[PDB]
Amino acid sequence: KLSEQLKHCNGILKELLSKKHAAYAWPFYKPVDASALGLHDYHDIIKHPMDLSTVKRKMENRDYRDAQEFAADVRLMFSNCYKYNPPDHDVVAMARKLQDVFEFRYAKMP
Amino acid sequence: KLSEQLKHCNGILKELLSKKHAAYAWPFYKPVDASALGLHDYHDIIKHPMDLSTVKRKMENRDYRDAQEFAADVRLMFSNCYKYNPPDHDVVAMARKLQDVFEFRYAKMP
Amino acid sequence: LSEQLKHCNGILKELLSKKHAAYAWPFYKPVDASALGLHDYHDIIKHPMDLSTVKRKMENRDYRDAQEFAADVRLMFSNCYKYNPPDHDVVAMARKLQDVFEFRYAKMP
Amino acid sequence: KLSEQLKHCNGILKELLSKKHAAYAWPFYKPVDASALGLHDYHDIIKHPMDLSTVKRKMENRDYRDAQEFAADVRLMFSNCYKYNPPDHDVVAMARKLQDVFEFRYAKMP
Numbered sequence: 392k393l394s395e396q397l398k399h400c401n402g403i404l405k406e407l408l409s410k411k412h413a414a415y416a417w418p419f420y421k422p423v424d425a426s427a428l429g430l431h432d433y434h435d436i437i438k439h440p441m442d443l444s445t446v447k448r449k450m451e452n453r454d455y456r457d458a459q460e461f462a463a464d465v466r467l468m469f470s471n472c473y474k475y476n477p478p479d480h481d482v483v484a485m486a487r488k489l490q491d492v493f494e495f496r497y498a499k500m501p
Numbered sequence: 502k503l504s505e506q507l508k509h510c511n512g513i514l515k516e517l518l519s520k521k522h523a524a525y526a527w528p529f530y531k532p533v534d535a536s537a538l539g540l541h542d543y544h545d546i547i548k549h550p551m552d553l554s555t556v557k558r559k560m561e562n563r564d565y566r567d568a569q570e571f572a573a574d575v576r577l578m579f580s581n582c583y584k585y586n587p588p589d590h591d592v593v594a595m596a597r598k599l600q601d602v603f604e605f606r607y608a609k610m611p
Numbered sequence: 612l613s614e615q616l617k618h619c620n621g622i623l624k625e626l627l628s629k630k631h632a633a634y635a636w637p638f639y640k641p642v643d644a645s646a647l648g649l650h651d652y653h654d655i656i657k658h659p660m661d662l663s664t665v666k667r668k669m670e671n672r673d674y675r676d677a678q679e680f681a682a683d684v685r686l687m688f689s690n691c692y693k694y695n696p697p698d699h700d701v702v703a704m705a706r707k708l709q710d711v712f713e714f715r716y717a718k719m720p
Numbered sequence: 721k722l723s724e725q726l727k728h729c730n731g732i733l734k735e736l737l738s739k740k741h742a743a744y745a746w747p748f749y750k751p752v753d754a755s756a757l758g759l760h761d762y763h764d765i766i767k768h769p770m771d772l773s774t775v776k777r778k779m780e781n782r783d784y785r786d787a788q789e790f791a792a793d794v795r796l797m798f799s800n801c802y803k804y805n806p807p808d809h810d811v812v813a814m815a816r817k818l819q820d821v822f823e824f825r826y827a828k829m830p
């Protein structure tokens with residue numbers, strides 16, 4: 392079943408947004424505020440931004456056919472991070488920790 | 502007299518808020534989202550929260566008697582950072598660099 | 612897309628390189644289920660994947676675009692993440708190798 | 721209670737004076753020596769000088785009714801520096817490095 396998978400994706404997303412992982416999840420909770428930061432190049436480099444509050448909306452909206460679609464957007468999020476920042480920056484540190492939460496639980500789907 | 506000083510303070514606040522210093526000013530731009538971060542003790546420890554936004558509004562209402570009441574609040578902000586956080590934490594290092602901008606320009610007061 | 616694939620082929624070369632061997636070697640060849648007495652590997656892991664199956668496919672010009680390359684690599688980390696418990700060393704060794712992958716994939720033009 | 725706070729402020733001042741920080745505290749252990757420096761204007765510009773010994777001496781004499789009066793002099797000290805000197809000068813870097821030691825430990829105070 393497809394939503395049988397999708398409510399397991401939805402459970403992952405609860406976990407990502409949950410407190411336990413907030414120390415490193417917080418910069419993905421909402422989309423990078425390129426305006427407040429002075430990021431004149433952000434939207435030239437990230438053609439398709441993506442963050443967990445977008446993923447939560449698309450989940451509540453029911454825009455997701457399969458769990459591959461879910462996973463595709465979450466990886467997009469992390470890769471935008473890895474693309475925009477240097478490897479030594481603190482966001483990359485965080486984004487890794489979170490992704491490793493995601494990749495693990497995602498791999499335990501039936 | 503004490504309003505040519507407040508004019509000078511406004512020029513400071515505008516430099517703090519300026520995009521030049523955004524790299525380390527951003528965490529002070531609005532309140533510290535305790536609920537999102539998971540900070541259940543932030544309001545235990547920090548009894549009088551303060552952000553450059555709070556400062557800007559108090560200036561915009563002309564609710565500052567003199568330059569010292571200005572400085573009280575901008576220091577209260579930095580203190581709260583320094584109280585809530587460890588010394589090794591990135592915010593503190595951001596808070597210090599911002600304070601250095603403030604403290605220097607507050608010292609060139611007429 | 613071969614311009615993109617030149618870049619993937621470099622990432623693959625980087626993964627197999629000596630720099631990362633510390634944590635790369637459990638993914639170098641197929642997991643040896645005979646060896647380990649893991650009678651339940653192939654029950655749980657339907658589509659196995661190693662870096663040198665990936666190299667074999669790279670050399671055969673099998674990859675259409677970078678998605679196909681990245682799919683087979685992520686599949687590799689995922690089998691590991693699925694088969695194993697989180698506390699296990701390979702789960703950390705895979706996570707270290709993947710970060711190296713995901714970063715460098717993300718820089719791709 | 722006041723002499724608990726002033727006990728703590730006392731410990732700050734002992735920390736300021738300590739060997740750890742002496743690389744950047746040395747321009748502040750004693751009064752700025754206008755005479756040694758050939759500075760016929762230092763006292764025109766800085767009406768109310770201050771330094772750590774003057775603070776140590778007041779701490780010794782119990783001239784401080786509370787923690788604010790402590791901090792206000794320790795800040796008048798860093799301010800006198802930021803007011804007299806250019807920002808490119810070593811003293812300003814020193815005053816800052818030492819101030820950030822002070823400001824931190826001051827906020828930890830109950």
Ligand SMILES: Cc1cc(F)cc(C)c1Oc1ccc(C(C)(C)O)cc1-c1cn(C)c(=O)cc1NCC(=O)N[C@H]1CC[C@H](O)CC1
Nearest residue numbers: 418419421422423424427428471472475476481482524591
């Ligand atoms: C910038 C930064 C500094 C830090 F110390 C810790 C984090 C997490 C940081 O990253 C962010 C902090 C806040 C925010 C807000 C709340 C505004 O959306 C976003 C990020 C951030 C998040 N994500 C996912 C990213 O991919 C990139 C982010 N930020 C990039 C960024 O701001 N770079 C600047 C570039 C200019 C330099 O002088 C300083 C660094």
Ligand SMILES: Cc1cc(F)cc(C)c1Oc1ccc(C(C)(C)O)cc1-c1cn(C)c(=O)cc1NCC(=O)N[C@H]1CC[C@H](O)CC1
Nearest residue numbers: 414481528529532533534537538581582585586591592595
């Ligand atoms: C946490 C953090 C990491 C980092 F690399 C850079 C900053 C600025 C950080 O601090 C903040 C990031 C975002 C925000 C938002 C946007 C939610 O208002 C606030 C802070 C923050 C800002 N200020 C001024 C503070 O004094 C404290 C702040 N944040 C503290 C904080 O998040 N603590 C937790 C404590 C639990 C730990 O497991 C992880 C850290």
Ligand SMILES: Cc1cc(F)cc(C)c1Oc1ccc(C(C)(C)O)cc1-c1cn(C)c(=O)cc1NCC(=O)N[C@H]1CC[C@H](O)CC1
Nearest residue numbers: 637638640641642643646647649690691692694695700701
């Ligand atoms: C078992 C083990 C211990 C260790 F310290 C490091 C690794 C990589 C280990 O795992 C492997 C060791 C060798 C090999 C060889 C080279 C023979 O293909 C493979 C693995 C291995 C690799 N990958 C990618 C995996 O996902 C899982 C692997 N090994 C699973 C494994 O052996 N599990 C057992 C399960 C039974 C338990 O009692 C103890 C752990």
Ligand SMILES: Cc1cc(F)cc(C)c1Oc1ccc(C(C)(C)O)cc1-c1cn(C)c(=O)cc1NCC(=O)N[C@H]1CC[C@H](O)CC1
Nearest residue numbers: 746747748750751752753756757800801802804805810811
């Ligand atoms: C001049 C200088 C050079 C240096 F590498 C480091 C310091 C601290 C320097 O400043 C001082 C050196 C000695 C002393 C003594 C110990 C005599 O009180 C004080 C200072 C000094 C300290 N503090 C807190 C100040 O605010 C200012 C100080 N001195 C300013 C000063 O000397 N400026 C002149 C201005 C004229 C210029 O042509 C050359 C430099």
